[PDB]
Short mmCIF file of C-alpha atoms in Angstrom, two decimals:
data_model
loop_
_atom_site.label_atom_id
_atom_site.label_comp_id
_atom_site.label_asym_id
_atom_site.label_seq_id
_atom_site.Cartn_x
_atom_site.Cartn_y
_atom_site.Cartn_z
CA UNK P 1 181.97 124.36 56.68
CA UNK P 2 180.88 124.28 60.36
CA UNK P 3 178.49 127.05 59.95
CA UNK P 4 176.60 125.74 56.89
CA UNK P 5 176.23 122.22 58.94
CA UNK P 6 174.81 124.04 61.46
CA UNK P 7 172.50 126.32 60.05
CA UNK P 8 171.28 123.25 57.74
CA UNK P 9 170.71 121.40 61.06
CA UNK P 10 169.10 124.17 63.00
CA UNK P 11 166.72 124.53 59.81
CA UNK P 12 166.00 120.71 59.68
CA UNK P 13 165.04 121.11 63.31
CA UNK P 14 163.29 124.22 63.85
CA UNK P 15 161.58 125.24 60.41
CA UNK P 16 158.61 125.16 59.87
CA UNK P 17 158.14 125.48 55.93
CA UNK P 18 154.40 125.20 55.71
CA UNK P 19 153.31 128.52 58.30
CA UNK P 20 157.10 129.93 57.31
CA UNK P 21 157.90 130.31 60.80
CA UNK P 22 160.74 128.64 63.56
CA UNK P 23 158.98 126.62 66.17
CA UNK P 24 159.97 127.33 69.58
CA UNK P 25 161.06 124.05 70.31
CA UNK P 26 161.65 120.70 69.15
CA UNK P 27 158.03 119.39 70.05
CA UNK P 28 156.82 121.66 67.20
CA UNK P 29 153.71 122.80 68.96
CA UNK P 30 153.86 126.18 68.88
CA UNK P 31 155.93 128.95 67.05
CA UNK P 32 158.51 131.37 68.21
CA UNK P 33 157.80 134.96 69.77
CA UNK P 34 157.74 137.59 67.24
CA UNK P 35 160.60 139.52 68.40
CA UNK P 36 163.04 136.63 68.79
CA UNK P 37 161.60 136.04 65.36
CA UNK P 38 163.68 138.63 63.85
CA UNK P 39 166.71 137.22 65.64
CA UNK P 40 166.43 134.37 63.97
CA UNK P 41 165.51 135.88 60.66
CA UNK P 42 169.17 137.90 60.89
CA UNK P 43 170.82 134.42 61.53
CA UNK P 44 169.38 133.41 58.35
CA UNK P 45 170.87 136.63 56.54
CA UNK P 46 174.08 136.15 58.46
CA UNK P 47 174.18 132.62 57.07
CA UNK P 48 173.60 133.54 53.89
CA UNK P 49 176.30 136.34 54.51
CA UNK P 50 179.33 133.72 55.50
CA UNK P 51 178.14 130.62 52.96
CA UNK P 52 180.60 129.85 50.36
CA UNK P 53 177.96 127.61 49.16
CA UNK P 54 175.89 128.68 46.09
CA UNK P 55 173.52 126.19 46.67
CA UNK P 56 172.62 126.79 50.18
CA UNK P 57 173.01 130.64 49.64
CA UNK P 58 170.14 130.57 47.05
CA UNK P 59 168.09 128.29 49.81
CA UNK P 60 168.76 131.00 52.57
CA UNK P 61 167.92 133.97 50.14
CA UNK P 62 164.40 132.44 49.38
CA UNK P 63 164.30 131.90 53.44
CA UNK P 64 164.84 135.47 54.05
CA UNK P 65 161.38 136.50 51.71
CA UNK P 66 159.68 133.80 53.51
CA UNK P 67 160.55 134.60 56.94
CA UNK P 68 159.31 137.67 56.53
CA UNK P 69 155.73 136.57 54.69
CA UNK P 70 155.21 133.76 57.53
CA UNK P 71 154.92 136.34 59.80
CA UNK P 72 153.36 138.97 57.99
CA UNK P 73 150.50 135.71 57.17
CA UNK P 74 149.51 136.09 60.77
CA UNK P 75 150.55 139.78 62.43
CA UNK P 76 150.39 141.81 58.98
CA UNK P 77 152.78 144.35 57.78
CA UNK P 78 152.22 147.33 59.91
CA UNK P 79 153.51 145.92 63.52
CA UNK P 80 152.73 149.49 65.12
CA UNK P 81 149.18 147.92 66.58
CA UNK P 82 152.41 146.25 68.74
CA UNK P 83 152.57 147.83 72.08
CA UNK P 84 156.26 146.66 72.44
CA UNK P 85 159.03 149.60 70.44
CA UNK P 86 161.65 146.65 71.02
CA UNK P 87 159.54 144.14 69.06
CA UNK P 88 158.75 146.97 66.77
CA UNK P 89 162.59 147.95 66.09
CA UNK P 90 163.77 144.19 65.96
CA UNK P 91 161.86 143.88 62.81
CA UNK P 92 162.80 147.41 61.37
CA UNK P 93 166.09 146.44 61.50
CA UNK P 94 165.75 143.15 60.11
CA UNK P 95 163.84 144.75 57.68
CA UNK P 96 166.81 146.87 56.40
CA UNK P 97 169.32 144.26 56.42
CA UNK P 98 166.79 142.20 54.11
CA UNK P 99 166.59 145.25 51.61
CA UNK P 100 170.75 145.33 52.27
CA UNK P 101 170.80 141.45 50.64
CA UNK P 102 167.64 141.63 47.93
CA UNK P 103 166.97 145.05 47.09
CA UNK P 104 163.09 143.98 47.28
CA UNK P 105 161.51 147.65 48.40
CA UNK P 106 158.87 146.34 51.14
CA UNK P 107 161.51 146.28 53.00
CA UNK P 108 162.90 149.15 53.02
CA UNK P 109 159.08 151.06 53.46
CA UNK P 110 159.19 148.66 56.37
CA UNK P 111 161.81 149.43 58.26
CA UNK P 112 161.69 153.52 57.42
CA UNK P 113 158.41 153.58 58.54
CA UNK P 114 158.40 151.50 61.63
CA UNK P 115 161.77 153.34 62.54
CA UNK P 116 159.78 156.70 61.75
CA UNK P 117 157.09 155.96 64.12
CA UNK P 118 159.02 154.89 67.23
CA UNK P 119 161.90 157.28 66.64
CA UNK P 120 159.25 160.26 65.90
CA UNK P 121 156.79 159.33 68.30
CA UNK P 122 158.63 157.52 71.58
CA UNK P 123 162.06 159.57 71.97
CA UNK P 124 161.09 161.82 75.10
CA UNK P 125 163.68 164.74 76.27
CA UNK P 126 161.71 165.12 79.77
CA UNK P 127 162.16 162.32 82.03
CA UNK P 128 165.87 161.13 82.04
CA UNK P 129 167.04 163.68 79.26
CA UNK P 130 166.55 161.37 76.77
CA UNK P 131 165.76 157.97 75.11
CA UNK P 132 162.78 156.09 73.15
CA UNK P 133 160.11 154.40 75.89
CA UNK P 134 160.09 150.35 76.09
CA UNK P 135 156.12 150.64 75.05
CA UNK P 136 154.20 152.77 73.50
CA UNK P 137 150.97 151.77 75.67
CA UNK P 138 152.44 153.24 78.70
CA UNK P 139 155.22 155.44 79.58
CA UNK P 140 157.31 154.31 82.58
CA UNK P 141 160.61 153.39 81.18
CA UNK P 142 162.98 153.74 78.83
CA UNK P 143 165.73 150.35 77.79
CA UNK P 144 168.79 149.29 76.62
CA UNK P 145 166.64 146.68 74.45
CA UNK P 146 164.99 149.28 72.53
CA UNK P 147 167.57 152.34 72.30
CA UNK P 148 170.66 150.38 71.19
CA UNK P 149 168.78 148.51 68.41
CA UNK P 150 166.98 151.98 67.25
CA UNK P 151 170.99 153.31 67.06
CA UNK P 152 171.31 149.91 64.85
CA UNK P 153 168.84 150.09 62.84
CA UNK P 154 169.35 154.13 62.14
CA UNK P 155 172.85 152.84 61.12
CA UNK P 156 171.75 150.36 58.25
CA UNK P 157 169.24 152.93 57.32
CA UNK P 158 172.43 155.77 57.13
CA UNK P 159 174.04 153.13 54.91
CA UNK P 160 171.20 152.59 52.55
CA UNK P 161 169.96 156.69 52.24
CA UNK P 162 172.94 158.14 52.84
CA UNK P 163 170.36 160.08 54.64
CA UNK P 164 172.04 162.07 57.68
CA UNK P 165 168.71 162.27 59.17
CA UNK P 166 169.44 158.62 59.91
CA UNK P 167 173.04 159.26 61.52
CA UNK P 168 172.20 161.78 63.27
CA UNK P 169 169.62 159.80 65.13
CA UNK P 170 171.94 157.07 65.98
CA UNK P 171 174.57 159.60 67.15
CA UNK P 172 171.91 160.98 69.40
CA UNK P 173 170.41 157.85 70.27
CA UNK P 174 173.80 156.30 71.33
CA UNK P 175 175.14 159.68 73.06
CA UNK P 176 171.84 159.51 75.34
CA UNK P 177 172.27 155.41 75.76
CA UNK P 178 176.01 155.61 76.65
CA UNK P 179 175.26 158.59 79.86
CA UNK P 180 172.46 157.35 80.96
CA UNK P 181 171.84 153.19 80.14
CA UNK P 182 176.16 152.88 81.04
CA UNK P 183 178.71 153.07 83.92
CA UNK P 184 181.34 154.78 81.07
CA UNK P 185 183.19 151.24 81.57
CA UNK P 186 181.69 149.33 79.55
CA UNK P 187 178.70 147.71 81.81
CA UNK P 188 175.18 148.50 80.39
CA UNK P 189 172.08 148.73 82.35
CA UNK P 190 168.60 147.38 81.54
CA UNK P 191 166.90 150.29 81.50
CA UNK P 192 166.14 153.53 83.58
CA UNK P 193 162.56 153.46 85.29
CA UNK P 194 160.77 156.68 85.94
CA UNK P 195 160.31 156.77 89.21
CA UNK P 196 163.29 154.74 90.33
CA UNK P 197 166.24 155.44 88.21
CA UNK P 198 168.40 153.14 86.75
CA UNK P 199 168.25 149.36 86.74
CA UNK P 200 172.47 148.27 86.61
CA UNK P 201 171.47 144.54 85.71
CA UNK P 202 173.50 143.67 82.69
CA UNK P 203 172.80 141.22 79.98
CA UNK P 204 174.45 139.64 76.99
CA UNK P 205 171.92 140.78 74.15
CA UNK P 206 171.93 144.34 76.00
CA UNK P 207 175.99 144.46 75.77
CA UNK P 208 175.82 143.00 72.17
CA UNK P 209 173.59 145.66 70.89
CA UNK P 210 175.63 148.23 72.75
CA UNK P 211 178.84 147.24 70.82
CA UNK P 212 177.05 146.81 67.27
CA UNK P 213 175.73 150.35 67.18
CA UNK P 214 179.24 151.92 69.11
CA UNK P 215 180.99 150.07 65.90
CA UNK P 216 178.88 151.07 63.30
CA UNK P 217 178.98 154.36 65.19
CA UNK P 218 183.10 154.36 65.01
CA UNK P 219 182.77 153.19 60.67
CA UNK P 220 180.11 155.98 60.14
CA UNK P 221 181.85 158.79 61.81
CA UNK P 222 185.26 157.65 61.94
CA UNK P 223 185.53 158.66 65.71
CA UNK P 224 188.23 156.47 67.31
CA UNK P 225 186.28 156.54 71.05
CA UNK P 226 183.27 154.67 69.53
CA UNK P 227 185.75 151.80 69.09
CA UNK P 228 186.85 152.32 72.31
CA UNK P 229 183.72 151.77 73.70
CA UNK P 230 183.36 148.53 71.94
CA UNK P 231 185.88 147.58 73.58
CA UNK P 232 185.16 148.33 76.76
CA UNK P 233 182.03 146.65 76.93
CA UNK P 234 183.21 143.27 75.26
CA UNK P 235 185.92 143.21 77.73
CA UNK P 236 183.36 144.15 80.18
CA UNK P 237 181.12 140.93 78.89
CA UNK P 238 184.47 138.92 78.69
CA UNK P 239 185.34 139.36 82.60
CA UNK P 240 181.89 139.48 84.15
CA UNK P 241 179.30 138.06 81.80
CA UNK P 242 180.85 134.66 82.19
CA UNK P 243 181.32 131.44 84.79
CA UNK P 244 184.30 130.83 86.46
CA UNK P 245 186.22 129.29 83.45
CA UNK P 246 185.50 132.25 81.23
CA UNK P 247 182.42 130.44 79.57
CA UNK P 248 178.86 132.75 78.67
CA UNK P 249 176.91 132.48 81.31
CA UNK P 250 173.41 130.71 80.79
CA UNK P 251 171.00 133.77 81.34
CA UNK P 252 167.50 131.75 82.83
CA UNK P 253 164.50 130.83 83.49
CA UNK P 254 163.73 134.09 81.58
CA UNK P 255 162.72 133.41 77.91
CA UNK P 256 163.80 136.38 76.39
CA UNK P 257 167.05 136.18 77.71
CA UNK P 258 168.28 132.34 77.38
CA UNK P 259 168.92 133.19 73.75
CA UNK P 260 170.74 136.16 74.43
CA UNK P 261 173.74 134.75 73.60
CA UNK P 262 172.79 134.76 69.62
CA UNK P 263 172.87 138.70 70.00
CA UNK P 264 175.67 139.12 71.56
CA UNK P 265 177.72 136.72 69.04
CA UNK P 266 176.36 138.51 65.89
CA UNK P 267 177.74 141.79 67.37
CA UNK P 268 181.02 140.65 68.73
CA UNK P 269 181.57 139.22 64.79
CA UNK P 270 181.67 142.78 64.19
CA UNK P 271 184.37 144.07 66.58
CA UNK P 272 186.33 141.05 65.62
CA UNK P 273 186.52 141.89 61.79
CA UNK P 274 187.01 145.71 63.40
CA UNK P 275 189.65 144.89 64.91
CA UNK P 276 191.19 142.45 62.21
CA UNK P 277 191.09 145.24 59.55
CA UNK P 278 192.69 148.00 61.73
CA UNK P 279 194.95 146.34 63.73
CA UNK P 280 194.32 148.61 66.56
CA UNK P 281 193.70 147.12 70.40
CA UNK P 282 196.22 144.20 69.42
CA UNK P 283 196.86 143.04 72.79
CA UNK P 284 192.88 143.01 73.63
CA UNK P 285 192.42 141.73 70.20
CA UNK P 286 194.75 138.59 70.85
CA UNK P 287 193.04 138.15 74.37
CA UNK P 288 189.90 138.26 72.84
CA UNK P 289 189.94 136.40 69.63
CA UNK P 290 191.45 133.26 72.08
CA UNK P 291 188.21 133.96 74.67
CA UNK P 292 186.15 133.67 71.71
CA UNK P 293 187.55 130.39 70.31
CA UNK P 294 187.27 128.94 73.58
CA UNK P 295 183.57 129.66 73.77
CA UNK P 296 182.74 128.51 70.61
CA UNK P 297 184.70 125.08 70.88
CA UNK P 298 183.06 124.24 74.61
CA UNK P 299 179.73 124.81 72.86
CA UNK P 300 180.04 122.96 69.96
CA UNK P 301 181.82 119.83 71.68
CA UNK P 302 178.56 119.54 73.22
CA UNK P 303 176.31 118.80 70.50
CA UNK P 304 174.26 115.99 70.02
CA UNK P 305 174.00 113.57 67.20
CA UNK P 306 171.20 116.44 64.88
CA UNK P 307 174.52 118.81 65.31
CA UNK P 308 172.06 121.20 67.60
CA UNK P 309 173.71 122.77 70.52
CA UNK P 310 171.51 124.28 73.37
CA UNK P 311 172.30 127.34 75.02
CA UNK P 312 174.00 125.62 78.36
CA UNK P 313 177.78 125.87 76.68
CA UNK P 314 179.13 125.09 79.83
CA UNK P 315 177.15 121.08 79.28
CA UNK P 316 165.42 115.94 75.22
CA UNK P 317 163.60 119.12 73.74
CA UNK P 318 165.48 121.53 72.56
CA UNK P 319 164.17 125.37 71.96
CA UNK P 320 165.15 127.12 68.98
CA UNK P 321 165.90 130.83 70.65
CA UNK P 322 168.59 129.13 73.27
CA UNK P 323 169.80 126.82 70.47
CA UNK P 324 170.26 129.89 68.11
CA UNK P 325 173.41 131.45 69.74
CA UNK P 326 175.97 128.18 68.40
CA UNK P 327 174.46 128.84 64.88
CA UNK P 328 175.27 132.64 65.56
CA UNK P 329 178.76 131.93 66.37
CA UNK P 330 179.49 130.14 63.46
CA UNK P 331 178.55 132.32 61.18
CA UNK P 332 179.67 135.70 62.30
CA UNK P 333 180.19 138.57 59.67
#
């Protein structure tokens, strides 16, 4: 299986078993940020998720509890001391996917209570009629990096409780995201900036969350223009998210974004097996399912000889959040 050789390489690479932690790069001199953290923590579970291996799905179960206590070891288990809601919500949600795969209840008072205090505390109706703030140090602006992954992570927690508390806030969430934080076409904006307005740059994590929560959104709800939306905004990613052969685009120098790619891979997994099971959008489908085999063969015909892949599909050390998105996209679910 491709995707258990390269999750078993990416681990080999990038693991750190003694502070339970990824390092942020091959020189092994200093671990990764805590938000990305949880990225890679879901590309564990999504491993773990595609595996037809019993023995490497028992190793990436164990992985998932220490993941979690690594980090826990040195920022503790109430992140809300973080002055970041995006870091905040990355972690709530990986924390309900982990309760999803072991049933093991700190995680789900994790991620209920971290959702609870950004969702309670940081969604404003006065500036921009809507949305949860980026921080809650200050107030200035309010991002697609924060309100699509809240919509995700009230999602998992809808299909855990069966709470409608929790749908309703993703409805919400995503009704406020899609006016304001999209062009209705399927482009999402980085954020909307009091003081300014909005920001129209778009992103590949920011269209990858968009498409997660509008599918979860169309399974919960069973409201055909949530898949629509998905669709809109992969085709959206497909046409203008990419080089001139249709490749990703490397997103750089910024940090946070150069693993991007990870994000949106996970999510487009989704619509895939949407589309798959419902056979509607066949002709998109089609296009689509050929764009994404492209991708994924450019990138992995450029791996080295450790089966690690960095970020630059379209072509020393090697960082784990940029090196991430191949692993991703061979393990989607």
């Amino acid at each position: 299986s491709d995707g258990d050789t390269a999750m078993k390489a990416f681990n080999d690479t990038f693991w750190d078993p003694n502070a339970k932690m990824f390092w942020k790069d091959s020189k092994r001199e200093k671990h990764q940020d805590f938000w990305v953290e949880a990225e890679l923590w879901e590309l564990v579970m999504d491993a773990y998720q595609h595996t037809s291996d019993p023995a490497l799905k028992a190793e990436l179960k164990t992985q998932i509890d220490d993941v979690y206590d690594g980090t826990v070891a040195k920022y503790g288990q109430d992140w809300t001391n973080n002055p970041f809601n995006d870091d905040i919500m990355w972690w709530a949600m990986g924390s309900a996917r982990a309760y999803q795969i072991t049933g093991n209840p700190r995680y789900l008072e994790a991620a209920r209570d971290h959702f609870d205090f950004v969702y309670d505390t940081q969604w404003d109706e006065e500036f921009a009629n809507g949305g949860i703030w980026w921080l809650n140090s200050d107030h200035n602006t309010k991002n697609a990096c924060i309100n699509f992954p809240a919509a995700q992570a009230a999602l998992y927690l809808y299909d855990i409780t069966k709470d409608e508390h929790y749908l309703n806030a993703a409805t919400k969430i995503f009704r406020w995201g899609k006016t304001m934080l999209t062009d209705g076409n399927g482009k999402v904006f980085d954020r909307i900036e009091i003081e300014h307005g909005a920001v129209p740059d778009a992103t590949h994590y920011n269209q990858g969350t968009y498409i997660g929560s509008a599918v979860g959104l169309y399974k919960a709800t069973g409201n055909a223009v949530y898949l629509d939306d998905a669709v809109k905004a992969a085709k959206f990613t497909k046409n203008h998210l990419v080089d001139s052969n249709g490749v990703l685009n490397y997103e750089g120098p910024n940090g946070d974004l150069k693993g991007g790619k990870t994000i949106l891979m996970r999510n487009l997994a989704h619509l895939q097996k949407t589309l798959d099971e419902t056979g509607q959008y066949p002709e998109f489908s089609a296009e689509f399912d050929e764009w994404l085999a492209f991708n994924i063969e450019m990138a992995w015909s450029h791996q080295n000889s450790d089966h690690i892949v960095d970020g630059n599909w379209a072509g020393g050390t090697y960082e784990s959040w940029s090196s991430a998105a191949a692993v991703q996209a061979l393990n989607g679910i």
